[PDB]
Homo-oligomer: A and B are copies of this chain.
Amino acid sequence: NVFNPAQFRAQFPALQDAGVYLDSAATALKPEAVVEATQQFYSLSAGNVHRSQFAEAQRLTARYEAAREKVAQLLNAPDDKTIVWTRGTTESINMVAQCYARPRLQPGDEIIVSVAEHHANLVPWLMVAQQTGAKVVKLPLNAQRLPDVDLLPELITPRSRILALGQMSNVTGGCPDLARAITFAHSAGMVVMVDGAQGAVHFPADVQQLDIDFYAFSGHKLYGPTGIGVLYGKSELLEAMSPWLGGGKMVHEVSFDGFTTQSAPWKLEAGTPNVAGVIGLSAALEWLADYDINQAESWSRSLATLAEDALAKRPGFRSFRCQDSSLLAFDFAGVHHSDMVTLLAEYGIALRAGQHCAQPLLAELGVTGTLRASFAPYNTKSDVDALVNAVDRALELLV
């Protein structure tokens, strides 16, 4: 099933106006299928009567009912009841911290968190640690700028309960030895929260093969709607979790004496779902299933490598890129990041700078922020040339 970059590119209506779009790691452009499924959803009754668009209404209902399974197929989850709808990776992780960890954490218990984590997979652990008297323990980087998994046997103690580890950094694009980390973690009776916001896009985790306890990601990074995300959990852990928000749909019986709940996933989904989000994400995954993602990722990484090798020929260049990622974090010594971002946009290159919600990682790397060009399968060789030329022009003006 051969990947064809031009066919892929052709599905994105934003592209002609977008210029050279290298900001996909912050959020992805949307394929036509997502745009149209969403338009149809808001242009049709959600009731049981359809006087004139019945056929289309049935297709939307089918999209909605198949959504969990499409996520399950992405992750190789054992069944679609292990998929919980959230509003994003951030909510997913907060739910694990509050619904799984909090009722189990004892004062003195330890939560090991990688120094490479996005704030989404750090602040919730700081919060629950304060709530329970538990403590957060730093998992540092090795000399290769990856979380030092080989150090885990030294950091694990009888008090360790939780490991929080990103599948893939949104700064370096680095992927730690997740399989080995889980083995150490499970040897000590710990559960692992895997942040897959970037991994789900580039190399979606086989959660059965890796024996992942919890996995989170966001739809809007996966060519999909805003306001929608996923929490995968093993059935036994979802069953063990306390309820998240209270309200309709998650409850079974309610009285002024108390309440009982549905089982998972529904236990964890109070209120009207973001139905537009679920349908659009369903459409994105259904569209995406026509493409070989390994081939699509190799294309992206190749472009990032051509970009990195060309930029390294310019003086002052510094790269924070790991493992030939699609993500290319860099800066030029002596040049202000925001000046470079602005000039690049004016020359038609869309990317960004800043701290990328990763202050502790940037402090270890010894910088205040980085530029990041992220390449996606709708990018081209021309896009690389345009990035390089735009950087040359920026440097002329700023240096």
Contacts and interface: CB of A to CB of B under 8 A. Distances in A.
A134 interface: no
A360 B245 CA distance: 19
Instruction: Quickly give the copy total for this chain.
Output: 2
A27 interface: yes
Which of A44, A113, A276 has the most chain B CB atoms closer than 10 A to its own CB? Answer: A276
B19 A51 contact: yes
B45 A21 contact: yes
Contacts of A271: 87-91, 120
A187 interface: no
A326 interface: no
Contacts of A256: 113, 115, 122, 126, 136, 138, 360
Contacts of A175: none
A155 to B, nearest CB: 13
A14 interface: yes
A305 interface: no
A350 to B, nearest CB: 3
Interface of A: 13-14, 16-21, 23, 27, 29-30, 34-35, 38-39, 42-54, 57, 87-91, 93-94, 97, 113, 115, 118-120, 122-124, 126-127, 130, 136, 138, 218, 220, 225-228, 243, 245-251, 253-256, 258-259, 270-277, 341, 345, 348-352, 357, 359-360, 363
B245 A91 contact: yes
A43 B127 contact: no
B272 A27 contact: yes
A39 to B, nearest CB: 5
A252 to B, nearest CB: 10
A278 to B, nearest CB: 9
Contact of A94 (B124, B226, B245): B245
Given A123-B254, A123-B259, A227-B227, 18 more contacts: A17-B44, A17-B45, A18-B44, A18-B49, A19-B50, A21-B47, A27-B272, A48-B350, A49-B348, A49-B349, A87-B227, A94-B246, A119-B248, A123-B250, A124-B247, A220-B275, A226-B275, A248-B357
A127 B35 CA distance: 39
A45 B363 CA distance: 31
